[PDB]
Amino acid sequence: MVKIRLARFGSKHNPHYRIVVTDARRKRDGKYIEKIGYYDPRKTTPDWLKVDVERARYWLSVGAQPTDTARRLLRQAGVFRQE
Amino acid sequence: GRYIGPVCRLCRREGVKLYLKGERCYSPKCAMERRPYPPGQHGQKRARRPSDYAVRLREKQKLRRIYGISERQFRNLFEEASKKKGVTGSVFLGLLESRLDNVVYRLGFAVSRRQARQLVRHGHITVNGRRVDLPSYRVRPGDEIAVAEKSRNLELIRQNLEAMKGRKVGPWLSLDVEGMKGKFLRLPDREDLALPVNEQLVIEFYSR
Amino acid sequence: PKKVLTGVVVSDKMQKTVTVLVERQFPHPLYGKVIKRSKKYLAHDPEEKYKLGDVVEIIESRPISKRKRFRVLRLVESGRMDLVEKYLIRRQNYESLSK
Amino acid sequence: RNLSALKRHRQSLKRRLRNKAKKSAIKTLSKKAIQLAQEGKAEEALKIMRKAESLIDKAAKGSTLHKNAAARRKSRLMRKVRQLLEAAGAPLIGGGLSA
RNA sequence: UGGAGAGUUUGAUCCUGGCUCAGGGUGAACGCUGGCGGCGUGCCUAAGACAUGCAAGUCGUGCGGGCCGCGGGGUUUUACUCCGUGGUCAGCGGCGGACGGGUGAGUAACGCGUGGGUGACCUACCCGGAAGAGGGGGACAACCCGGGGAAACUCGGGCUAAUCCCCCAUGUGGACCCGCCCCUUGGGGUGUGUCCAAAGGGCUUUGCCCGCUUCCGGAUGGGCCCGCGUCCCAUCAGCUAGUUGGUGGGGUAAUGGCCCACCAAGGCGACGACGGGUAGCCGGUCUGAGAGGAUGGCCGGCCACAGGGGCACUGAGACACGGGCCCCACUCCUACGGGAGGCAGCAGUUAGGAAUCUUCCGCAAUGGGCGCAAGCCUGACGGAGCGACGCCGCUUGGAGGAAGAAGCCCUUCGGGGUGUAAACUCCUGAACCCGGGACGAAACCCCCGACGAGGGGACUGACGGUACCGGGGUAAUAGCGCCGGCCAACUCCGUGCCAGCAGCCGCGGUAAUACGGAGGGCGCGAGCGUUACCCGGAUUCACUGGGCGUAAAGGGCGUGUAGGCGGCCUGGGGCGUCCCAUGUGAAAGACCACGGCUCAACCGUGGGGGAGCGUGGGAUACGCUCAGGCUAGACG
Ligand SMILES: [K+]
Ligand SMILES: [K+]
Ligand SMILES: [K+]
Ligand SMILES: [K+]
Ligand SMILES: [K+]
Ligand SMILES: [K+]
Ligand SMILES: [K+]
Ligand SMILES: [K+]
Ligand SMILES: [K+]
Ligand SMILES: [K+]
Ligand SMILES: [K+]
Ligand SMILES: [K+]
Ligand SMILES: [Mg+2]
Ligand SMILES: [Mg+2]
Ligand SMILES: [Mg+2]
Ligand SMILES: [Mg+2]
Ligand SMILES: [Mg+2]
Ligand SMILES: [Mg+2]
Ligand SMILES: [Mg+2]
Ligand SMILES: [Mg+2]
Ligand SMILES: [Mg+2]
Ligand SMILES: [Mg+2]
Ligand SMILES: [Mg+2]
Ligand SMILES: [Mg+2]
Ligand SMILES: [Mg+2]
Ligand SMILES: [Mg+2]
Ligand SMILES: [Mg+2]
Ligand SMILES: [Mg+2]
Ligand SMILES: [Mg+2]
Ligand SMILES: [Mg+2]
Ligand SMILES: [Mg+2]
Ligand SMILES: [Mg+2]
Ligand SMILES: [Mg+2]
Ligand SMILES: [Mg+2]
Ligand SMILES: [Mg+2]
Ligand SMILES: [Mg+2]
Ligand SMILES: [Mg+2]
Ligand SMILES: [Mg+2]
Ligand SMILES: [Mg+2]
Ligand SMILES: [Mg+2]
Ligand SMILES: [Mg+2]
Ligand SMILES: [Mg+2]
Ligand SMILES: [Mg+2]
Ligand SMILES: [Mg+2]
Ligand SMILES: [Mg+2]
Ligand SMILES: [Mg+2]
Ligand SMILES: [Mg+2]
Ligand SMILES: [Mg+2]
Ligand SMILES: [Mg+2]
Ligand SMILES: [Mg+2]
Ligand SMILES: [Mg+2]
Ligand SMILES: [Mg+2]
Ligand SMILES: [Mg+2]
Ligand SMILES: [Mg+2]
Ligand SMILES: [Mg+2]
Ligand SMILES: [Mg+2]
Ligand SMILES: [Mg+2]
Ligand SMILES: [Mg+2]
Ligand SMILES: [Mg+2]
Ligand SMILES: [Mg+2]
Ligand SMILES: [Mg+2]
Ligand SMILES: [Mg+2]
Ligand SMILES: [Mg+2]
Ligand SMILES: [Mg+2]
Ligand SMILES: [Mg+2]
Ligand SMILES: [Mg+2]
Ligand SMILES: [Mg+2]
Ligand SMILES: [Mg+2]
Ligand SMILES: [Mg+2]
Ligand SMILES: [Mg+2]
Ligand SMILES: [Mg+2]
Ligand SMILES: [Mg+2]
Ligand SMILES: [Mg+2]
Ligand SMILES: [Mg+2]
Ligand SMILES: [Mg+2]
Ligand SMILES: [Mg+2]
Ligand SMILES: [Mg+2]
Ligand SMILES: [Mg+2]
Ligand SMILES: [Mg+2]
Ligand SMILES: [Mg+2]
Ligand SMILES: [Mg+2]
Ligand SMILES: [Mg+2]
Ligand SMILES: [Mg+2]
Ligand SMILES: [Mg+2]
Ligand SMILES: [Mg+2]
Ligand SMILES: [Mg+2]
Ligand SMILES: [Mg+2]
Ligand SMILES: [Mg+2]
Ligand SMILES: [Mg+2]
Ligand SMILES: [Mg+2]
Ligand SMILES: [Mg+2]
Ligand SMILES: [Mg+2]
Ligand SMILES: [Mg+2]
Ligand SMILES: [Mg+2]
Ligand SMILES: [Mg+2]
Ligand SMILES: [Mg+2]
Ligand SMILES: [Mg+2]
Ligand SMILES: [Mg+2]
Ligand SMILES: [Mg+2]
Ligand SMILES: [Mg+2]
Ligand SMILES: [Mg+2]
Ligand SMILES: [Mg+2]
Ligand SMILES: [Mg+2]
Ligand SMILES: [Mg+2]
Ligand SMILES: [Mg+2]
Ligand SMILES: [Mg+2]
Ligand SMILES: [Mg+2]
Ligand SMILES: [Mg+2]
Ligand SMILES: [Mg+2]
Ligand SMILES: [Mg+2]
Ligand SMILES: [Mg+2]
Ligand SMILES: [Mg+2]
Ligand SMILES: [Mg+2]
Ligand SMILES: [Mg+2]
Ligand SMILES: [Mg+2]
Ligand SMILES: [Mg+2]
Ligand SMILES: [Mg+2]
Ligand SMILES: [Mg+2]
Ligand SMILES: [Mg+2]
Ligand SMILES: [Mg+2]
Ligand SMILES: [Mg+2]
Ligand SMILES: [Mg+2]
Ligand SMILES: [Mg+2]
Ligand SMILES: [Mg+2]
Ligand SMILES: [Mg+2]
Ligand SMILES: [Mg+2]
Ligand SMILES: [Mg+2]
Ligand SMILES: [Zn+2]
């Protein structure tokens, strides 16, 4: 299936993830379908987590499955907020 | 490496009085005041008409040995300037003058650039509050270069900033003597520098 | 869109098949001269409608057989045997250089 | 000294004997039906073609004779039967073939 | 925002012309030397051969058991047996093993790049929508019994469960033949006839959860087809028998000569077929003013391969690296009958080679498989280790210090040089010694809410007592090449065409700035040189950008085929050409801006780009084409 997960792009001891939509079969740093956000786990900058909300809603509507970490990051970005 | 060794021998070889010891290049003991000829057994002999490559190489070596920067960082800074937009020479000089050790020397915290290098390397210098121990650090316009509060009681800093009373600083620099700090106002213009170096000769030297 | 070419029928000797020669001009990649290349395509004529010399349009099609991947869209203009004669002369010249 | 995924191998063998069986039936029945269509016996031919189609679809239920290859077999069978009966006529039983 | 030349044919000159050097680059190696850290990187040769460990499994919420153990029952005891439970072992069953990881062999090809087609197709798991799950029946393992074999393992008989297989029914629907309609290749709709569905389990138990079946669609992934592009050799010129096409079949998810029967004689080629050679291709990378040349290592995309060759099975998907069968070579076991194996997975061994690493730590992070979940697996990965292999940062001190110690080298014997260099004076405090001590990690889970949104709680760190912060604190590695010209740096002695140096010109045969040593100097510096290779200079294969009277170079001459090229005027078309809009041009890299590790290397974010190709529209000067006209070319 198509999944929403994190890809590692930073250097050694400097992790930087791209929140990304890709087929689960391809490698985690391989050709992804679309970059829907980025995440910095060490909080180096005031903007360490950005997510495109409408695109995430689309890819969830068509049937993508986020990882538990990806789902956590999306929930922190109010992707599931229906208030 | 930083070439470490005799310095006023460069005052002699370069043919122009350099200031590598800070003082004693102003006193009648520089050995350039009393021995203006180049070093070596063949220093007093009649010099032959140098080639163009000789002129450009000696000019570039003068400009490099003034700051005490290795050939690696020097060539890297030159290529970096040539990549940028604007006059290569003036931008190169503004880059060299932006080095933290050179800024420490210009602000009168150290009498020589090598003493400034030792002051920076030993963490006696702060930038915007945070301690920095890298002579190759690039100072940006607006940064406050200060003296470490734990080092302001040392004898050398007391002497240097006690002699800086009444002295003037470069047009692109400000200095607070009581607080033992200063500010890097802007990048210096070519007119601001009194360097005895022709930058176009260095540009032509690296044009080869 | 399915590619559409335009060429000359130079061989009707097959059953339900024609040989459409298609030319093309393009500037040389390095020397800039407008050079003229050509290629023959085996086109499908299910009614034996087109004959020798007919200038026809050709459309990319679902494969009919090996080497046969095109159909004849329509007839641009009727038989002009000058181009067929040029092709036949260019072929016949090959018998002069053997050994 | 090897891993127990050999189990898979074993399973495949079973499935092999399961698939080869079904197909072996289908083909056979098909031939039979076609024979009865060539000889003119229409009621029997269609009565057997019904069972052949049933076996085809039931094999399509599983992984033996899955997607539209089964429709291909059914189409070819029904076409051949209707064509061979048209050489004789009288489609008596009125089974798989539409009116 | 971009372009340097020089040495060398001569007694001297100009030209042609080759050679060589200064530059940059490297998966490098070798010599001398060698202090620290960060980030990268590391079998280019034998796609040679491999000991050993690990690397692909997982579900008791699909099912029945074996072994060992415990508890409670039917009994007065025994025998026997029922239920619960723990551990363990496989088995049947489902999903995964087709991903991930490795390598460059083979391939000059729809392999790849690029732009399209599929009205000729498939897609397990996932998402949305509609509907449904009624009844019956059966077998094989595990297990029990017997046999064969040295072993691998194998054969026969018997019992049994299921989400295992089968039958009938229900027909939301779908499949097929035929007919009609719309559409136009096999797309969609409709009618009759025929055919086709299902499986249960778990609970917080009559209500939900994980599922199951049929169908439509989405999404993702892929199969096939086509235009254009992709090295050298013409001392390879003719190639082709399934060859080219047709009909009808078989085959596949699907077109096809893919395969097969019958029929027609075709198909390809100097616009380079066929053949030989070499070689994965690309994003990119190196270089370059650019055009271009070279290259395809790391990372990313596609391909192919898994000792060599061939083949099918299973499956949504394989012609399957750690699945199966056969042949061949090799190694091992062997009761000589017969078997076992396949590092181009991680590490490691050996061989080859100038040369390329640890038989390491970890499931914490990211990702992947199975599972409701807990959780299990993961040599993917995250880290550490080794190697100046590269890039970057840093240290071996800072300041004062004689008309100038000694030693050493020159010397006009007056002196000069090594040189403020040193010893010394004062100061800072690399190393180290202590103390604190991480970010990377908040989700899965549990609770409230409604297993939703939302809120709350809890666990979890390999790196690692590492980074970093504070205190204390010692002056504490420098080497390598060069010094005749190109090319920056000169003297002494030794040697005597000897010993030797040398990239090119060249130097040495008695007083060598060229050999060797010394003093001194120049260049770089934890590096410096050498060799190899690539681009550069090289306008020296000249598109930008060259030439052929005498320097290399006009064919011995003609006729003339293909091809290349085409006088003047008008018109049509719009193929070349040009313009606008749009799609494409993945990411990384490159460029610019800001930001994170104290800087930098490294990295993040954002921005900007861009040739080419597809589509729609437009322009018609020129090239093209068609039609007409003219006479200056040509011919008569
Ligand atoms: K011929
Ligand atoms: K000369
Ligand atoms: K048995
Ligand atoms: K019906
Ligand atoms: K699709
Ligand atoms: K496999
Ligand atoms: K201190
Ligand atoms: K929640
Ligand atoms: K300290
Ligand atoms: K000798
Ligand atoms: K010498
Ligand atoms: K060009
Ligand atoms: Mg994939
Ligand atoms: Mg935020
Ligand atoms: Mg939502
Ligand atoms: Mg510039
Ligand atoms: Mg520039
Ligand atoms: Mg044409
Ligand atoms: Mg014909
Ligand atoms: Mg055909
Ligand atoms: Mg298994
Ligand atoms: Mg299994
Ligand atoms: Mg039979
Ligand atoms: Mg199958
Ligand atoms: Mg020359
Ligand atoms: Mg001569
Ligand atoms: Mg001479
Ligand atoms: Mg002469
Ligand atoms: Mg070189
Ligand atoms: Mg070089
Ligand atoms: Mg050593
Ligand atoms: Mg390292
Ligand atoms: Mg490593
Ligand atoms: Mg290589
Ligand atoms: Mg290899
Ligand atoms: Mg008991
Ligand atoms: Mg009783
Ligand atoms: Mg008893
Ligand atoms: Mg048990
Ligand atoms: Mg089990
Ligand atoms: Mg068994
Ligand atoms: Mg792979
Ligand atoms: Mg070949
Ligand atoms: Mg060839
Ligand atoms: Mg293509
Ligand atoms: Mg091609
Ligand atoms: Mg394509
Ligand atoms: Mg299914
Ligand atoms: Mg299914
Ligand atoms: Mg569904
Ligand atoms: Mg039963
Ligand atoms: Mg039964
Ligand atoms: Mg039974
Ligand atoms: Mg039995
Ligand atoms: Mg029994
Ligand atoms: Mg079933
Ligand atoms: Mg119906
Ligand atoms: Mg039924
Ligand atoms: Mg049933
Ligand atoms: Mg109930
Ligand atoms: Mg289940
Ligand atoms: Mg597609
Ligand atoms: Mg063939
Ligand atoms: Mg056919
Ligand atoms: Mg298949
Ligand atoms: Mg051929
Ligand atoms: Mg051609
Ligand atoms: Mg090869
Ligand atoms: Mg460049
Ligand atoms: Mg470039
Ligand atoms: Mg280029
Ligand atoms: Mg290439
Ligand atoms: Mg590769
Ligand atoms: Mg690659
Ligand atoms: Mg091997
Ligand atoms: Mg093989
Ligand atoms: Mg084999
Ligand atoms: Mg499957
Ligand atoms: Mg394969
Ligand atoms: Mg295999
Ligand atoms: Mg293996
Ligand atoms: Mg075996
Ligand atoms: Mg060896
Ligand atoms: Mg390693
Ligand atoms: Mg471990
Ligand atoms: Mg893990
Ligand atoms: Mg995980
Ligand atoms: Mg790793
Ligand atoms: Mg360095
Ligand atoms: Mg000193
Ligand atoms: Mg002290
Ligand atoms: Mg935290
Ligand atoms: Mg609850
Ligand atoms: Mg929460
Ligand atoms: Mg966990
Ligand atoms: Mg710890
Ligand atoms: Mg400290
Ligand atoms: Mg010189
Ligand atoms: Mg020498
Ligand atoms: Mg050389
Ligand atoms: Mg002598
Ligand atoms: Mg001598
Ligand atoms: Mg000498
Ligand atoms: Mg020396
Ligand atoms: Mg080197
Ligand atoms: Mg060269
Ligand atoms: Mg060139
Ligand atoms: Mg040039
Ligand atoms: Mg040449
Ligand atoms: Mg030219
Ligand atoms: Mg020439
Ligand atoms: Mg000549
Ligand atoms: Mg002549
Ligand atoms: Mg012609
Ligand atoms: Mg002609
Ligand atoms: Mg004209
Ligand atoms: Mg013409
Ligand atoms: Mg016109
Ligand atoms: Mg046009
Ligand atoms: Mg890009
Ligand atoms: Mg970027
Ligand atoms: Mg910064
Ligand atoms: Mg553009
Ligand atoms: Mg257009
Ligand atoms: Mg017009
Ligand atoms: Mg005319
Ligand atoms: Mg005349
Ligand atoms: Zn001086």
Swiss-Prot record, chain A:
Pfam families: Ribosomal_S16
GO CC terms: cytoplasm; small ribosomal subunit
A single BP term in Gene Ontology: translation
GO MF annotations in UniProt: structural constituent of ribosome
Superkingdom as given in the UniProt entry: Bacteria
SUPFAM superfamilies per UniProt: Ribosomal protein S16
Residue stretches in coiled coil: none
Keywords assigned by UniProt, alphabetized: Ribonucleoprotein, Ribosomal protein
Subunit field text: Part of the 30S ribosomal subunit.
HAMAP family (UniProt xref): Ribosomal_bS16
Summary of the function given for this chain in its UniProt record: Binds to the lower part of the body of the 30S subunit, where it stabilizes two of its domains.
UniProt family annotation: Belongs to the bacterial ribosomal protein bS16 family.
Protein name per its UniProtKB record: Small ribosomal subunit protein bS16
Organism: Thermus thermophilus (strain ATCC 27634 / DSM 579 / HB8)
Swiss-Prot record, chain B:
Family statement drawn from the similarity comment of this UniProt entry: Belongs to the universal ribosomal protein uS4 family.
Gene3D superfamilies: Ribosomal Protein S4 Delta 41, Chain A, domain 1, RNA-binding S4 domain
One GO-annotated biological process of the protein: ribosomal small subunit biogenesis
Keyword Ribonucleoprotein: yes
Cofactor annotation: Zn(2+); [4Fe-4S] cluster
Note on how the cofactor is bound: Binds 1 zinc ion per subunit. In a number of structures (e.g. 4Y4O, 5FDV) a 4Fe-4S cluster is seen in place of the zinc cofactor.
SUPFAM superfamilies per the UniProt record, alphabetical: Alpha-L RNA-binding motif
PANTHER family the record matches: 30S 40S RIBOSOMAL PROTEIN (PTHR11831), SMALL RIBOSOMAL SUBUNIT PROTEIN US4M (PTHR11831:SF4)
Gene Ontology cellular-component terms listed: small ribosomal subunit
Cysteines joined through disulfide linkages: none
Known partners and oligomeric status: Part of the 30S ribosomal subunit. Contacts protein S5. The interaction surface between S4 and S5 is involved in control of translational fidelity.
Entry keywords, A to Z: Metal-binding, Ribonucleoprotein, Ribosomal protein, RNA-binding, rRNA-binding, Zinc
Function of the protein: One of the primary rRNA binding proteins, it binds directly to 16S rRNA where it helps nucleate assembly of the body and platform of the 30S subunit. Binds mRNA in the 70S ribosome, positioning it for translation.
Residues bound to Zn(2+): C8, C11, C25, C30
Name of the protein: Small ribosomal subunit protein uS4
GO MF annotations, alphabetized: metal ion binding; rRNA binding; structural constituent of ribosome
Record-annotated S4 RNA-binding domain positions: 98-160
Stored InterPro entries: Ribosomal_uS4, Ribosomal_uS4_bac-type, Ribosomal_uS4_CS, Ribosomal_uS4_N, S4_RNA-bd, S4_RNA-bd_sf
Organism annotation: Thermus thermophilus (strain ATCC 27634 / DSM 579 / HB8)
UniProtKB/Swiss-Prot annotation, chain C:
Signal peptide (from-to): none
Coiled coil: none
GO biological process, one term: translation
GO cellular component, one term: cytosolic small ribosomal subunit
Keywords for this protein: Ribonucleoprotein, Ribosomal protein, RNA-binding, rRNA-binding
GO MF entries: rRNA binding; structural constituent of ribosome
Phenotype upon gene inactivation: Increased generation time and a temperature-sensitive phenotype.
Disulfide bridge positions per record: none
Top-level taxon in the UniProt lineage: Bacteria
Stated role: One of the primary rRNA binding proteins, it binds directly to 16S rRNA where it helps nucleate assembly of the platform and body of the 30S subunit by bringing together and stabilizing interactions between several different RNA helices. The combined cluster of proteins S8, S12 and S17 appears to hold together the shoulder and platform of the 30S subunit.
Membership in a protein family: Belongs to the universal ribosomal protein uS17 family.
Known partners and oligomeric status: Part of the 30S ribosomal subunit. Contacts protein S12.
Protein name in UniProt: Small ribosomal subunit protein uS17
Organism expressing this protein natively: Thermus thermophilus (strain ATCC 27634 / DSM 579 / HB8)
The gene coding this protein: rpsQ
UniProtKB/Swiss-Prot annotation, chain D:
Region annotation (Disordered) ranges: 1-25
GO molecular function, one term: structural constituent of ribosome
Entry-linked Gene3D superfamilies: Ribosomal protein S20 (1.20.58.110)
Transmembrane segments: none
Origin superkingdom: Bacteria
GO terms under biological process: translation
Recorded GO CC terms: small ribosomal subunit
Alphabetical keyword list: Ribonucleoprotein, Ribosomal protein, RNA-binding, rRNA-binding
Pfam families: Ribosomal_S20p
Similarity field: Belongs to the bacterial ribosomal protein bS20 family.
PANTHER family reported in the protein's UniProt record: 30S RIBOSOMAL PROTEIN S20 (PTHR33398), SMALL RIBOSOMAL SUBUNIT PROTEIN BS20C (PTHR33398:SF1)
Biological role stated in the UniProt entry: One of the primary rRNA binding proteins, it binds directly to 16S rRNA where it nucleates assembly of the bottom of the body of the 30S subunit, by binding to several RNA helices of the 16S rRNA.
Subunit structure and binding partners: Part of the 30S ribosomal subunit.
Protein name: Small ribosomal subunit protein bS20
Species for this entry: Thermus thermophilus (strain ATCC 27634 / DSM 579 / HB8)
Gene that encodes the chain: rpsT
